[PDB]
Every structure is written in C-alpha cells, then in structure tokens.
C-alpha cells in the first residue's frame, strides 16, 4: 500500500539480515542488493520466502544502481568496515536518481561525530564521518543511527558463554559503562526510524535504560544466571594502548575498539543533545529486549558468536 519501498545494501550481513527481517515484518516492500558470488544463498532463499526482492549485482554497476534507486524510497546501508567509502557509489546513484526520501549510512555503532578513539579505530570512524559530510553537502535526507553495542555479539565476545573456562578476561578496570542492544531490535527499530518524521535529518541513538551495564556487572549477573563463579583476569589499559601501536593491521583494530567501548566507555560518555533522538522513547508498542532477557536467551538458546570484518 502506502508503505515506503526499502532498499538494503549488505542485507545478508550480520546486522543487515535483521533489518531485512524487520522491514518485511513491518510490511515494507523490501529489496536486498547482494553480490553474484555471495555464499549467503540459503539466507537469500529465506529472505525470498519472506517476501524480499533479491537483486544481484556489484556496487560498481552505476547504471544498475540508478535504475534500482528510481524504484525505491528509502535506502539503508549495512556494509562492513572495508566497504565504508564504497558507499560513495551508493550515494552517487542516490544523487542521480533524485527520488530517495531517506538514506541511512552504515553507522550502527558509536556516535562518531562526538567521540574520538585510538588511531586504528579513529581512521575507520573518520571514513564514516566522510560519508556523513558528503550526505549533508548534497542535501540528501538522512538518519544517522548510533546503535551502540550489538548485544549477542559482545555477550559472546565478553562472556564466551560457549566456553567452559573458569576465568574471564576483563578489559581495563571493567567499571566503564556501555549500552548494548539485541540485534533483532536494532533491526526493527532501524526500519521504524527510517520512515519516522521525528528521525528525519537527525541522529538517533539506541540507549534504553534497561541496557546499560559495566563489564563487572555483566559478569556478576551471568554468574548468578548459571550458578558459576569466574576468576577475573584484567588487561591493563596501558597494555591495550601499547598493542594498538605495535600490532599490525587489522589485528590492532579490535583492540582499539575494545578500548573505546569498554575502557573509555564511549557509548555512555556523553549526554544527549537538544536534537538527538533516543529511540526507546519513540514507540509505546515496542521495547528493546533487556539485558536480563538477553542473558536468559543465552541460557536457553544462545546465538552463535561472530567476528566483524576488518
Ligand atoms: N555496534 C556494534 O557492536 C557493531 C558490531 C559489528 C558491526 N558493526 C557495524 O555494523 C555495520 C555492518 O557490519 P556487519 O558485521 O554486519 O557487516 P558484514 O556482515 O561483515 O557484511 C555485510 C555485508 O557486506 C557485503 N559485502 C562483503 N564484502 C563485500 C565487498 N567486497 N563488496 C561489496 N559488498 C560486500 C556482504 O553481502 P553480500 O555477500 O550479500 O554481497 C555482507 O553480508 C558496520 O557499519 C559495522 O561497523 C557494529
């Protein structure tokens, strides 16, 4: 019907698949752009059975992108770090088509316009800033989503629930606060804000009050959930900083990110600005899965661990 048509790049991705599923769940005609050689064949079949329109192609096919843009209203990019500046190909097609009502670049993490990080990670978020600056310069309608930490991703990374070990690694003192959200909710909320007038040309942050915690508190709550105590092993901050300077790339990127998220506490080190929009306050019919509900999920049916591409 009146539902905006949504085109998602990187839809077969770790977070992208949740945006595809949320888009379809909300009744939006959904287009998924994917490479001809992608191994996500079974996932594509699932998308297809859910109503998605699969489009195979490369980002280098400018004409194809333009003709595709002319058929949709909203464009969301969930591309990975190595493809951040490749989004300029998406933006060029958007500019040529001229009918796009909203573009969401691949941010979905920290709010890069108000935080800085160590060189390895700073270089990456600067690329995301470059995309943002280009969007504004071209007057393209946008929404910048700061989804903070992907919950399943980091519960797996921090607690290694699938590991029967008696020790757990803590980064820094472990007292830095961070916010983490369930991937499925990040996906649904993202589709929602992409058509919400309240999010037009604004920064949207996912910071539900029920999802703020520290490494130490997360460990304590997990210990209570499973009835086991862990020996906490700390990795000194000065130690983490040194590694980012000596280790080769991309090996030093994960370390820099851990410092930003769990030592500097970048997702919780600022207060909201006047024009910021905190997503959990937008829809009374929805709510973000809480940390306690997440831990229960890991007790009953834990999702597999993942590792971002660098
Ligand atoms: N906040 C957090 O905790 C957190 C954690 C992880 C990631 N992130 C962010 O989430 C966003 C997406 O990350 P992700 O881990 O979901 O991405 P991903 O799964 O690694 O990749 C997304 C998609 O990119 C496409 N792709 C891969 N290589 C490509 C290439 N050479 N050329 C063109 N397309 C290519 C693939 O789709 P096809 O195979 O269909 O072509 C892939 O499924 C990024 O902005 C990332 O920084 C945030």
Residue numbers in the entry: 5 to 314
The article reads:
The basil EGS and petunia IGS are closely related to a number of other NADPH-dependent enzymes that act on phenylpropanoid-derived substrates. Structurally, the PIP-family proteins organize around an N-terminal, Rossman-fold domain, containing a core, six-stranded parallel β-sheet flanked on each face by an α-helical layer. In summary, a mechanistic scheme emerges in which binding of the coniferyl acetate substrate within the active site of EGS leads to deprotonation of the p-hydroxy group (PUSH) coupled with expulsion of acetate ion from the C1 substituent (PULL).
